[PDB]
Design a protein around this ligand. Structure first.
Ligand code: 3PH
Ligand code: 3PH
Ligand SMILES: *[C@@H]1O[C@H](CO)[C@@H](O[C@@H]2O[C@H](CO)[C@@H](O)[C@H](O)[C@H]2NC(C)=O)[C@H](O)[C@H]1NC(C)=O
Ligand SMILES: *[C@@H]1O[C@H](CO)[C@@H](O[C@@H]2O[C@H](CO)[C@@H](O)[C@H](O)[C@H]2NC(C)=O)[C@H](O)[C@H]1NC(C)=O
Ligand SMILES: *[C@@H]1O[C@H](CO)[C@@H](O[C@@H]2O[C@H](CO)[C@@H](O)[C@H](O)[C@H]2NC(C)=O)[C@H](O)[C@H]1NC(C)=O
Ligand SMILES: *[C@@H]1O[C@H](CO)[C@@H](O[C@@H]2O[C@H](CO)[C@@H](O)[C@H](O)[C@H]2NC(C)=O)[C@H](O)[C@H]1NC(C)=O
Ligand code: TRP
Lengths: 458, 469
């Protein structure tokens, strides 16, 4: 029963982040041997991070996950800002990066050594997005029966990196990796550029937090759910290291930083037939990363509307098929606004900064729930000095990423500071604007008439 | 909340809203086919990119002539086995060639006793030579052995014989290629009978054994008409001549001396060297020595350097040394004949740690020649400038363009470069961020203006500017 549960965690963690990251990890860490340390340090931190998220899932169990843990510890202001970011910043720019990966990898065989057009990527990524939200809204039984097709693509692609990698290991192709003396590069990057190599090394590990509260189906938790974390996530780190060793046995590290698509520059070498199946089996992997992130984008609009925030035009469910239309129309409008503007590799720094910032305040919530409110029934516990390693790693990464790229992190903190006026207009308002509150009723029923959607029964 | 009801909605919703729900459902699905055809048109209207040329190993990087093996490391450790210890040093220089001196036991003008198949016992044996080639193969450094037969006499190629010395070489082409040397050199082909038809027989066996081999030939002819007569029969021959060994201190001379060589050969692959077996410290002073290393590493072709070129090893400085083969300055005790005669900057140990030295200019130019696509096989388009200075642009299809402005004068002259004499595909913008300069005192990485470019005497500076629209 445990072996069935281990596949649930490794299936949703491993997506299309192994195809984007190793160009940006190598660019910011400099050397090849320092980049393989980053994939090891990040995988250990995720094991520490997914441990302290499992303790809140058995202590204060509620639907919503990350949003409801902050809701218990100063949950008025801080709980809304957890969901204000995950609606505008986290969930749109996680789909726009995977959508821009799809256009960048289908336009590597065409245009192999030149640059693809600047508006041929903003229009081919908006085609993967606008098609998938049409598929997603529709009869959701269709949207899950197509997701095991895209899951077979990322299993065919990541196998081909491994088996063609291990063939080059039993040869004379172990020059750059195995020698352990080829570890020198541009050292004018400080420690503060190694901090940006952790913003992009954990994009490949992302998606672990909202999984562990879903594994509920698990048999006898309180000992297993943990026993499941110690098996699944180091098996991701084994794959992510072995698929990054196989990237450097095929090409030069300077050759790896020139291509826009790392997985198919591997494919144009090492066989002649893999030029056809390296774009296909990875463009399938980026279809599942957007389709699998439009399921979980609507589960957070449900939990936000029933708690006071996020007015009730959202979280409505269509009458014939159990699909939320206006929750999908807010992660499709706001994703196109983030898509047309900026570069993909500086968009990962825009997510990974603010994604760590609320990674910390829930682990800080795990320690202040031990100072305040003790003797609560906890089936499993960790060391008291165990989550303070995560807070040590969070503090030394956040202030160094602010020093390195202050403009991409200054706009990440500017939208959180936009949260405190819209929150104080949100729930702390006197209901005396009669002329303004019926605008919300008029906004709802027109959206309830041109779209036939209805609130659920409960 | 804000709900209506499930049942109250369906008696109120869609009497005529069903018309707007069908019509807006087709407006999405029609604009998505307009976004699909509008994204295929952009791909076709995006032009192409150029196919990369078939680059051999000597196309990408520089060669490194090693004349005297006993003077390269010193007379105490002078052997072929002692050469193996210095392979880690040359890999830091990122050279790709190892054109070492001839080692085939010459007997000082006796044609019957100089067998090219047998190595001189003063250098080693057969067994340490292949393990030298096996050691250099792991670091990807290619070893080129030269077969000039009379290399210790006053005249090479044995002037009393015309045919036996020629078939002595031709038998040794299929002997050393069995051991796997990656090329051959023949110096002094100006002293040959029927020279231009004997290279064509030797480039047969060099290319016919394997396509990734090469032949180099060295003259001392500095005239343009003599060189082209050697390259009118053969085409894939690197000919390192003495063609640039004149002054060129006026700027318009070397512009008219370099762009005449590519124009007469039709922009083929040449080799840029000031001589065949002589250092850069000859033929030019020590203030123009950093100006020519920027020139030789950025011209289209394989730059060929001698040993002791990266540190500026002058043979005329230290007394009591042969002019053709000076001792390489490794440490402070590398020249033990005169105590207290070398400096700290006149040593490869002191040149290495100085970030503004001459070896720091060689190593910072050798990687950019070896790794950058616009310097490997980028096009060369020199253009006009002020009274005396040299300026040219290295550019490729979409890659990072390069722009070198070399000042050969002695006055602090303003550049005044005009972009009117360029093609439209490779024109220059107003700003271009600096990369390196010969004498320091400028902010590297700072985008300066290209119209107000005031330049110091003996100051060549390397700028780059990205592909734009
Ligand atoms: C395409 C143009 C460029 C991109 C612009 C953004 C486009 C976003 C489109 C996102 C995807 C839309 C998919 C719609 C089809 C869903 C498929 C389905 O299952 O249908 C079920 C369902 C089927 O209905 P039935 O056929 O009656 O059973 O579809 C609907 O009931 C309605 C479908 C149309 C939805 C109308 C959306 C109107 C948006 C207009 C916004 C105007 C301004 C609003 C201002 C608000 C201020 C706060
Ligand atoms: C586009 C997608 C269409 C389908 C979905 C429709 C969604 C419509 C609302 C979208 C925004 C949803 C989040 C609203 C804020 C959440 C915070 C909260 O707790 O609200 C509770 C609050 C009370 O909800 P109740 O508990 O359901 O009554 O909801 C609102 O007050 C919604 C207010 C709508 C406006 C939001 C802020 C707009 C900022 C821009 C203001 C522009 C000023 C005018 C500029 C010139 C205009 C010409
Ligand atoms: C070697 O070079 C010669 C030219 O110098 C090439 O042509 C041969 O020339 C000789 C006379 O010198 C003829 O006897 C041969 O029949 C020619 N070969 C032909 C026509 O194929 C010769 O091709 C070169 N060798 C190789 C292998 O290309
Ligand atoms: C190349 O070096 C030789 C050696 O000094 C120069 O002189 C020639 O020497 C040979 C043999 O000693 C004579 O047969 C020639 O007549 C000499 N040349 C002249 C012009 O007298 C030779 O001049 C050098 N080549 C150049 C282009 O300077
Ligand atoms: C050098 O290049 C130029 C053009 O790129 C050519 O020189 C021409 O040579 C002929 C010969 O009489 C003159 O009539 C022309 O006026 C020259 N052109 C110019 C623009 O001046 C030629 O391709 C090369 N020069 C030589 C001598 O081959
Ligand atoms: C190494 O640095 C020394 C500085 O001490 C240079 O020595 C000077 O050289 C110039 C001529 O090049 C003389 O006019 C000075 O009198 C020298 N100064 C001293 C203190 O001796 C030396 O030239 C440098 N080495 C090289 C190869 O340029
Ligand atoms: N969205 C996640 C990262 C992520 C989402 N889907 C993925 C698939 C594969 C790898 C990483 C991811 C974050 O913000 O951290």
């Amino acid at each position: 029963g445990l072996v069935s549960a281990c596949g649930i965690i490794v299936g949703n963690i491993i997506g299309s982040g192994i195809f984007v990251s190793p160009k940006g990890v190598l660019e910011n860490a400099g050397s090849v041997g320092l980049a393989l340390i980053v994939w090891i340090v990040t995988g250990f931190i995720t094991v520490v991070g997914a441990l302290c998220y499992a303790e809140l899932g058995v202590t204060i169990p509620k639907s919503g996950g990350d949003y409801s843990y902050v809701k218990d510890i100063f949950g008025g202001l801080a709980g809304f800002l957890r969901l204000w970011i995950a609606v505008l910043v986290i969930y749109p720019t996680n789909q726009a990066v995977i959508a821009l990966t799809f256009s960048n990898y289908v336009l590597q065989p065409l245009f192999p050594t030149c640059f693809p057009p600047e508006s041929g990527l903003r229009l081919l990524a908006a085609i993967c997005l606008l098609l998938l939200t049409w598929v997603n809204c529709s009869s959701v039984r269709w949207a899950t029966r197509v997701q095991d097709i895209f899951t077979a693509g990322k299993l065919l692609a990541l196998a081909l990196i491994i088996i063609m990698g291990i063939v080059q290991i039993c040869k004379g192709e172990y020059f750059w990796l195995e020698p352990k003396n080829a570890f020198e590069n541009f050292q004018e990057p400080d420690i503060g550029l190694v901090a940006l190599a952790f913003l992009q090394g954990s994009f490949a590990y992302g998606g672990w937090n909202f999984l562990n509260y879903v594994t509920e189906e698990l048999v006898d938790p309180y000992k297993n759910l943990p026993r499941a974390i110690f098996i699944s996530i180091p098996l991701v780190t084994f794959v992510y290291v072995f698929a990054n060793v196989a990237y450097v046995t095929a090409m030069s590290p300077q050759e790896l930083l020139a291509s826009n698509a790392v997985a198919v520059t591997f494919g144009e070498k090492l066989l002649g037939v893999m030029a056809w199946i390296m774009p296909i089996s990875v463009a399938l992997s980026t279809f599942g990363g957007v389709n699998g992130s439009l399921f979980t984008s609507s589960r957070l609009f449900f939990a936000g509307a029933r708690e006071g925030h996020l007015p009730s035009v959202l979280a409505m469910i269509h009458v014939k098929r159990c699909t939320p239309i206006p929750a999908l129309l807010f992660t499709c409008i706001s994703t196109l606004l983030m898509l047309v503007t900026s570069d993909m590799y500086t968009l990962i720094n825009y997510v990974g900064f603010i994604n760590y910032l609320f990674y910390g305040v829930t682990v800080a919530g795990q320690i202040v729930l031990r100072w305040k409110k003790p003797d609560i029934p906890r089936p499993i516990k960790i060391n008291l000095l165990f989550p303070i390693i995560y807070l040590l790693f969070w503090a030394f990464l956040l202030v160094f990423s602010l020093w390195s790229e202050p403009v991409v992190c200054g706009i990440g903190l500017a939208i959180m500071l936009t949260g405190v006026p819209v929150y104080f207009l949100g729930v702390y308002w006197q209901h005396k604007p009669k002329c303004f509150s019926d605008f919300i009723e008029l906004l709802t029923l027109v959206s309830q008439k041109m779209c036939v959607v209805v609130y659920p029964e409960v | 909340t804000g709900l209506s009801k499930e049942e109250l909605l369906k008696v109120a919703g869609s009497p005529g809203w069903v018309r707007t729900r069908w019509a807006l459902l087709l407006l999405f699905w029609l604009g998505w086919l307009g976004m699909l055809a509008g994204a295929v048109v952009i791909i076709v209207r995006a032009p192409r990119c150029r196919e990369l040329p078939a680059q051999k190993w000597w196309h990408t990087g520089a060669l490194y002539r090693i004349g005297d093996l006993q003077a390269f490391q010193g007379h105490g450790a002078g052997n072929l086995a002692g050469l193996k210890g210095r392979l880690d040093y040359l890999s830091s220089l990122k050279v790709k060639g190892l054109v070492l001196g001839p080692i085939h036991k010459n007997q000082k003008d006796d044609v019957a006793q100089t067998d090219l198949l047998q190595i001189d016992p003063n250098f080693g044996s057969k067994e340490d030579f292949d393990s030298l080639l096996q050691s250099a193969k792991k670091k990807s450094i290619r070893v080129i052995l030269d077969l000039t037969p009379n290399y210790r006499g006053e005249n090479s190629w044995f002037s009393t014989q015309v045919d036996t010395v020629a078939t002595k070489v031709k038998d040794a082409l299929e002997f050393w290629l069995q051991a796997g040397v990656d090329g051959f050199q023949v110096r002094d082909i100006e002293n040959l009978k029927d020279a231009s038809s004997f290279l064509a027989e030797w480039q047969n066996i060099t290319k016919g054994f394997s396509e990734d081999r090469l032949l180099i030939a060295g003259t001392n002819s500095s005239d343009l008409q003599q060189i082209l007569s050697l390259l009118e029969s053969n085409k894939d021959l690197l000919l390192t001549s003495s063609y640039l060994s004149d002054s060129g201190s006026t700027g318009e001379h070397t512009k008219s001396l370099v762009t005449q060589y590519l124009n007469a050969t039709g922009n083929r692959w040449c080799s840029w060297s000031l001589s065949q077996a002589r250092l850069l410290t000859s033929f030019l002073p020590a203030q123009l020595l950093r100006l020519y290393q920027l020139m030789l590493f950025t011209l289209p072709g394989t730059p060929v350097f001698s040993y002791g070129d990266e540190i500026g090893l002058d043979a005329a400085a230290l007394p009591g040394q042969p002019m053709e083969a000076p001792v390489m300055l490794w440490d402070e005790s590398s020249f033990p004949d005169i105590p207290g005669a070398v400096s700290a900057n006149m040593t490869v140990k002191g040149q290495s740690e100085d970030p503004g030295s001459l070896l720091s200019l060689f190593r910072r130019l050798s990687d950019q020649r070896s790794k950058e696509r616009s310097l490997l096989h980028g096009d060369f388009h020199a253009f006009s400038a002020g009274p005396g200075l040299f300026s040219y642009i290295r550019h490729w299809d979409q890659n990072e363009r390069f722009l070198v402005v070399l000042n050969f004068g002695d006055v602090g002259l303003s550049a005044g470069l005009q972009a009117s004499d360029l093609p439209a595909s490779a024109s220059l913008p107003a700003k271009a961020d600096l990369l390196l300069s010969t004498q320091p005192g400028r902010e590297e990485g700072s985008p300066l203006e290209l119209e107000r470019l005031k330049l110091e005497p003996h100051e060549g500076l390397l700028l780059r500017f990205p592909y734009a629209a």
